[PDB]
């Protein structure tokens, strides 16, 4: 496990101490505090000492070219007799080999420790972020959604890992440049400055690119976040989007977000491609200008000078034109993270109640609670009652102390428990979610479980109450998680219970069972302040408080094959472009090798010669080799991005069109998060990291092949050692790779519980903060953070274990080239050896990176496969057929079912059979029956959500013989759950612009909603809150009624919806629906039978068969009818009223 100096608690507490200290100094000054200053003051002392590695390592990198000059010098002055020289030359090859091993170790030590340093910063920052989140002020939480905080950990803090890697090169790079300039000066004189002048033009330009890249990346994130939030509501709402046929509107909305987003990605990618192209060509330019100026100044090319100089510039090429720019960009990216984090860190952060008045926000036109005056004492039940918005839940929040008085006073005695109306549940076992860290005891537990009506589900769960649960309770039903949430509070045996209408979360039988056995009986000794709409229970309450107008008013995977690679490339461009993509890659490297070979050839030719070389020839071909290198290096870089970004564009469009036409069965099988991960996570890789990692891999891979090719071209005998040395690499790689994918698997699975704990906590915050549970919930995060730290730690160490041994076989290659040249020295010339050795030394950093990036590519291809499979989903029958209805159709509104059979899957059971019925024009019909009898399947048949067997007719057209959008648009659905989609009210009422603004207000008047919209500052064009949060559920259902009122249609289907409205407004829309749709034929699924008893017929489903379909009075006068038995099951008063109503209405409807 992770040792104490890396453990979450210790490591986050340290930086927090410096943050609090910096706040105090800023407050003593005038200035705003700086989180960057706190980080430096925390970590500088341990980070600076790592600079010793870079100091010694870079000193070695400048010495190693000087040794190489003395080895090459043996071939220039060669004499086969003079053994004393031969022994000395063997001495330098030993020193050069020692340099190579020392340099390899120092490089691995430095890069190891800076990567630990970055890990610690991340771990400390996550601890700070989570510690803040518990304490956020209840009003200041309203301006930052849970997903925005979770994005801090997911995206923003993961930058700090990268920041620490390159910072030392901000000084070591420039200093090395100065030293390298001084070294070159002794070797090639003033011509040194020509190469440095290029270098000091590159430095600003590459730094500006890094700044401008960061700005584009920041401006892109807004579109990506908007696309993901929109795509989340598409995937979550997909049945409603289908039934309204609104697919065209979300296609347009996602299309244009993606079209904006992809344009910034392209530009961004070209910038980043230009940066990495610069690193490729930089030395080739620097060397070109240096030796071009050198020969115009009258100097002559000699092998020793060239390859020493080439090797020195190679040092500068890493530090100044790769590592220094990488620092600037990653520091730039750091500050955007620090800025967003700082803004979060600076966010705001017996019972008696008398004169109590309070504001949730002083900008409110009134206090949000006012003048409350009541008290309650042990043994009493207080019921809190009143309309919507009367402040009932605010009263509980006041007694809980989350809402302090602006006037009046509150006091409480004994232990407090609070139960929120929305259920909350976390991971662990469901019993653990009930115990909440208390000790288990059967004797209290069984009493709690039976009083909470919860026993049956804890038996039927697949491992009972020891079933493991998801971090937000997604593994439980609403009624289960509600009772689990209540059972937790009831287990606490508290003295004051604050109950925010948990009874509203469950069915009426369960509600009274909870009220009787728990609230009345088990809690009998205790103060209960129960908010509930269960006003029918009030006879049992000891006292009753009625609120109105805000005041008191009354009192009483794993592996991927070649097929995925071919598809990924070919999806982006025609194969002709891909062949050209390969060719420019080869040509880039060939020109790159040939430029260095040309210097070697020129050095050899100068050695053969008074007479002198024709500079127009040698300097001419030199200039063409360089220019071709530059041109292909640029084009190669850009074209990789063009193809791979175009591939992501094509695969997104194909995937999105598939998900739109995919049948609902696809979403019944795959949970929402698993689909959305393709769009957010997998396409995120394809847009960003994957194209860069391909270019990074391809560019290094070709250079490794270039080094080995150069060596075998000069010293063919190397092919003999290279066979064993190759075999060793294959065995080593084979052995590593399997453990490599084990730790990448382990790393992934250990990361996700961290983010899932933050989101779990943020939803539950009114619970965990109530029971004083902040300390325990910190240690839970520290545990998950610590377990992830092990897998990350193992990933780091295993990566270095591998890389160290790859550098051992690289060092054997260098040793073979260095001594092999001295053994074979009769046969090969100084410029050949200088070429071969110079190339061999470059291998040391390069080869281990090439082989590790290979695994990165392989690992990310799993994302590519996971999206390609979604391009191949089965499709619904098309939107419009070759046959199409006449525009007058439908016109009567006949529907017929004839021998209809339905199942949700072809291998699934039938859930409607032989269903055969007529629905006449302007007739009114209700659907009734048992739970699971098939009621929901009747909608699914008629909308063809799954294709029925048999015949369905609408106005004598078979619904199978017309397009889905012909059918779906000519019907109107009022769904049970409302949805308001993000956007304006105008879009939510009309996404296609076919109703006039006059008509839209006429609709908004007829639903009696206009005034509350005119109170909004932008009126109909105002942006609604996410999910409609600025409206209650009943208010949102008014907007669904408005859509149906606007869309003129003959046939209306009502999905049991109005019973979810508040009773004083359920009755209102029930009245409106009778008024407005008098001209329609009407279908209505309903539980609250009193809402349909008037209808001309009712349909009763027993189980998959339509057993009754008749006039409701004619049903009820059959006392043996299922419909009678159902109303008889409601209760005597209900059955009397219903039967009386049926008799009266049936008589009246027989009079005409
Ligand atoms: C972030 C760099 C992206 C581009 C890299 C480029 O394609 C290759 C650079 C090679 C170069 O040829 C020699 C060398 O040492 C580089 C690899 C080092 C990268 C830093 C992390 C090293 C380590 O962790 O061991």
From TrEMBL:
InterPro entries from the UniProt entry: AAA+_ATPase, ABC1_TM_dom, ABC1_TM_sf, ABC_transporter-like_ATP-bd, ABC_transporter-like_CS, ABC_transporter_C-like, ABCC4_TMD1, ABCC4_TMD2
Domain ABC transmembrane type-1 residue range list: 48-332, 575-859
UniProt GO molecular function: ABC-type glutathione S-conjugate transporter activity; ABC-type xenobiotic transporter activity; ATP binding; ATP hydrolysis activity
Main location group: membrane
Domain of life: Eukaryota
Spans through the membrane: 91-112, 163-182, 188-209, 276-297, 303-324, 573-594, 621-645, 689-708, 714-736, 802-824
Protein's name according to its UniProt entry: ATP-binding cassette sub-family C member 4 isoform X1
Gene: LOC109566910
